[PDB]
Design an enzyme around this catalytic site. Sequence first.
Site, PDB file in Angstrom:
ATOM      1  N   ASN B  81      35.775  33.578  34.112  1.00 49.97           N
ATOM      2  CA  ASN B  81      36.182  33.530  33.056  1.00 49.97           C
ATOM      3  C   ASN B  81      34.476  32.838  32.522  1.00 49.97           C
ATOM      4  OD1 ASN B  81      38.672  33.964  32.688  1.00 49.97           O
ATOM      5  ND2 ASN B  81      39.606  32.358  32.003  1.00 49.97           N
ATOM      6  N   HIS B  82      34.167  33.400  31.507  1.00 51.84           N
ATOM      7  CA  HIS B  82      32.525  32.968  30.754  1.00 51.84           C
ATOM      8  C   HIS B  82      33.404  32.538  29.481  1.00 51.84           C
ATOM      9  CE1 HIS B  82      29.411  36.457  32.656  1.00 51.84           C
ATOM     10  NE2 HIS B  82      30.855  36.229  33.292  1.00 51.84           N
TER      11      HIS B  82
END
Lengths: 203, 203, 203
Positions: B81-82
């Site tokens: 996940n960013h």
Amino acid sequence: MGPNPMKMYPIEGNKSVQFIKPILEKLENVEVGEYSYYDSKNGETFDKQILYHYPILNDKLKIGKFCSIGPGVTIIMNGANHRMDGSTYPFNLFGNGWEKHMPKLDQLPIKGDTIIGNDVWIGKDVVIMPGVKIGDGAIVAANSVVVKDIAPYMLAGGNPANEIKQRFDQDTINQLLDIKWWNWPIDIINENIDKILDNSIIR
Amino acid sequence: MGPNPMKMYPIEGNKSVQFIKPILEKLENVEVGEYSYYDSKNGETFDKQILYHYPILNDKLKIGKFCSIGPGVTIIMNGANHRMDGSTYPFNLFGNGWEKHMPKLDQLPIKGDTIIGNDVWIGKDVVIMPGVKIGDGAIVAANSVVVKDIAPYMLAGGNPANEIKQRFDQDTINQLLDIKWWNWPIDIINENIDKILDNSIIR
Amino acid sequence: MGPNPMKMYPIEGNKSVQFIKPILEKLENVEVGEYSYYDSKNGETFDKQILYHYPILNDKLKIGKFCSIGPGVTIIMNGANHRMDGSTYPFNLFGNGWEKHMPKLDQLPIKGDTIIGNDVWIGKDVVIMPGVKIGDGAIVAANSVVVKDIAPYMLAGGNPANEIKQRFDQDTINQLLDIKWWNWPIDIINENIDKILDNSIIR
Ligand SMILES: Cc1cc(C(=O)N/N=C\c2cc(Cl)cc(Cl)c2O)c2cc(Br)ccc2n1
Ligand SMILES: Cc1cc(C(=O)N/N=C\c2cc(Cl)cc(Cl)c2O)c2cc(Br)ccc2n1
Ligand SMILES: Cc1cc(C(=O)N/N=C\c2cc(Cl)cc(Cl)c2O)c2cc(Br)ccc2n1
């Protein structure tokens, strides 16, 4: 006169471009038209791309003539289907007594035969799922997952693949489906490739 | 009575079919039910199919019992996940001074835990995205990319996956969800496998 | 002051994380912004991920600054397009007299240039099809197949990829599109990374 449709590698020294028919002729329940080719991803032969095709299930694969099959295309036959009137868990696979619960052939879903027509282009990495029919002259976008039928001369794409639009006007499609150039004597095809390539064959 | 669910490779001579519970025994934040199996494509072990699962993010993976997991299935946990309240660019990754911009734990999106129910069949090459719940008895089509929840005993497919239809009528589904045959001792299940396979177990 | 944008491998000891600009600088008809990186799948270099890009077709690839390109992303340029005003069958490929039927440059479909904006995050295994434009600040979900344009600061996903929703309110998006932080002097970027990350730069 053009290439020899019985060579698995019609181009000398080229192991990527493959004619499908001679490669698959050994296979039961498979029928392939002349000149249909596979554009190999890593040198793999097209037989490796046909999955779960088991003579016992009696499902058939048919591919027409003059098809272009892109690299990594897989054709999924009915052999990975689970029983599904109750639990999909394949108790039978694990033995120690559970083999008594082997599904009968008539308890296994059969989605149908897979039929790809003539002059069909299947893009890179497309997955063709069981029981699908793809009409003459269709184009299937790279990376599609085809789960239902595609009509003739449709552009189609996606997962699940859908028909996007017709390639040509209906009149043109009708005339192409009537004349069936792919069924002409090969010497007549050769005389007319330029017109086959530009659609003026119907004029 | 069937094989021992603690046996990594329960089918003699076969080092591809794997019981996932003993395969994943070493992994933190992973809970896996007995009899669930992975149908390995090349002998790879199922632990290599669980991606970006990092203890520090504290997301959990739970898979029920009697699941059938096809070859190439990947389960994506929250570790890729960013950060996304502003730029998704991970400046911190590059160090050289930028490591001071490491996100704090509560700055990273966590989509949730991933929970796959009991008696679920997940087709070849399916991708399960972070945070998804799949209900007991669901069937996920090959090549699906599952981004949202799937209800019990639904057929689902596509990218993004959508529910296609219920496998059985609602009352049958309700009764199956009440009886939970998967929770019975195996020496009780053993006496009822035919009824489990044909859904008459509810009667 | 952060990493060196001219290093192929900006992180010492790490041969996975790559800056795309220095790798692709050797390539005609490709333009890439500083700091944009590729998160390698198996150690492959990002040039291997750009397919069918031939200078004769004169299609261009542009990628902005501060992009995050996930493992296995492929960019499909126009070089695998079949002629499709009539039959898609590539007669000319096979020689043996059919070589005379080579398509003219103007007979080969060209979808357009591929343009990826700044601060764009492309997820794992995405396929970017020819002719696509992806706006600044967009996020493309893992396993998407992008066939049409994606607007700035959109979340997009699927096969075919569709816009899901705007990441921020319209005023915020328009403010970010005006500010263009990615074009600031690098020392000013460095002074403001936490504000770029929490979006407070808009104030
Ligand atoms: C120039 C062009 C346009 C198209 C076109 O008009 N595509 N339209 C939508 C589209 C939809 C999906 Cl699902 C996938 C792709 Cl690759 C598309 O281009 C095209 C479609 C396919 Br099938 C194959 C080649 C094509 N070439
Ligand atoms: C005989 C049959 C029919 C179906 C069925 O009715 N499928 N319907 C649509 C369909 C949709 C997607 Cl997106 C993908 C696939 Cl493979 C489908 O079959 C079926 C669905 C899944 Br899922 C698994 C096995 C199935 N077997
Ligand atoms: C927490 C969150 C939510 C979302 C979100 O609201 N996603 N919504 C739908 C969705 C749709 C597809 Cl076709 C694929 C994915 Cl993976 C989605 O999450 C999200 C979307 C992307 Br694209 C990337 C990261 C995301 N992270």
